[PDB]
Amino acid sequence: IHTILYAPNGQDVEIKDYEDPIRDITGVNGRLHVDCQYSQGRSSATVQY
Amino acid sequence: ASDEEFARPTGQGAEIRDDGETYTTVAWNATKLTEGSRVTDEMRDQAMV
Numbered sequence: 001i002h003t004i005l006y007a008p009n010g011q012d013v014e015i016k017d018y019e020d021p022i023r024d025i026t027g028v029n030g031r032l033h034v035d036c037q038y039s040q041g042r043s044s045a046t047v048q049y
Numbered sequence: 050a051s052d053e054e055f056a057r058p059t060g061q062g063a064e065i066r067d068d069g070e071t072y073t074t075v076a077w078n079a080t081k082l083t084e085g086s087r088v089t090d091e092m093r094d095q096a097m098v
């Protein structure tokens with residue numbers, strides 16, 4: 001099972017900050033692009049109640 | 050230029066509003082002030098001054 005992580009800048013989570021001088025607010029934003037896929041799903045079994 | 054004002058009491062995170070320096074003119078329109086005097090040649094000759 002493969003966790004696929006995409007970031008446009010660097011390889012991992014991107015943190016950006018902004019200053020708003022009109023309102024005097026600082027923001028912190030985070031982004032990552034993520035998917036998950038089985039390469040083989042017959043490699044896995046779920047336990048059902 | 051416009052008069053000085055008082056800064057505005059504001060909440061946190063609220064927009065700082067615009068009250069920019071505002072301008073006008075006074076227009077000068079220079080008015081021709083004139084004065085004339087006429088004298089005859091006989092007057093000019095005979096006068097002591």
Ligand SMILES: [Mg+2]
Binds near residue numbers: 054068
């Ligand atoms: Mg004003």
